[PDB]
């Protein structure tokens, strides 16, 4: 585990932990998922936490979060996640689309932060992220 990987997990955690209290609640999870166009029920949110809630305190701490993400790591689930970003449906995630998703998530990005994110997944160097690229990234 590298230093940059930890900083990414730390930011991924911060995106959920809206009030920055060090834990992720079912409420925070729902807010994020709705902001990405999903609509989990209360039961589903509780189930998500329960699966990784080692200490049974009802909320997710940093390690439990890491476990959640490691368990997350078919075609349909990936396609769906692609469509969260590919808003116009043209088959390419642009920088403007990525920035739009991050902004709905309450995260403001500099053009450089966004470009850097595209750069990470863009394999062919067209400056966009196609489905295959998005699959190589997620897989």
């Amino acid at each position: 585990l590298t230093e940059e990987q930890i900083a990414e997990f730390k930011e991924a955690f911060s995106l959920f932990d809206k009030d920055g209290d060090g834990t992720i609640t079912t409420k925070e999870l729902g807010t994020v998922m709705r902001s990405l166009g999903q609509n989990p029920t209360e039961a589903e949110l509780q189930d998500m936490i329960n699966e990784v809630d080692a200490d049974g305190n009802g909320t997710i701490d940093f390690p439990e979060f890491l476990t959640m993400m490691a368990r997350k790591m078919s075609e349909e689930e990936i396609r769906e996640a692609f469509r969260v970003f590919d808003k116009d449906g043209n088959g390419y995630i642009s920088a403007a689309e990525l920035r739009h998703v991050m902004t709905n998530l309450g995260e403001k990005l500099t053009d450089e932060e966004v470009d850097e994110m595209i750069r990470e997944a863009d394999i062919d160097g067209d400056g966009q992220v196609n489905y295959e690229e998005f699959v190589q990234m997620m897989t």
């Binding site: 940059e4 900083a7 990414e8 997990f9 730390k10 930011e11 991924a12 911060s14 995106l15 959920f16 994020v32 998922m33 990405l36 999903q38 993400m69 997350k72 790591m73 689930e77 769906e80 996640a81 969260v84 990525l98 998703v101 991050m102 995260e107 403001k108 990005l109 500099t110 932060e113 850097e116 994110m117 595209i118 990470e120 997944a121 992220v129 998005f134 990234m137 997620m138």
Partner: peptide
């Protein structure tokens, strides 16, 4: 906005999303 010790990853953001 750049935050020291923090880094925005597309990958982890993907998994974070469905």
């Amino acid at each position: 906005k750049k935050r020291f010790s923090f880094k925005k990853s597309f990958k982890l953001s993907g998994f974070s999303f469905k």
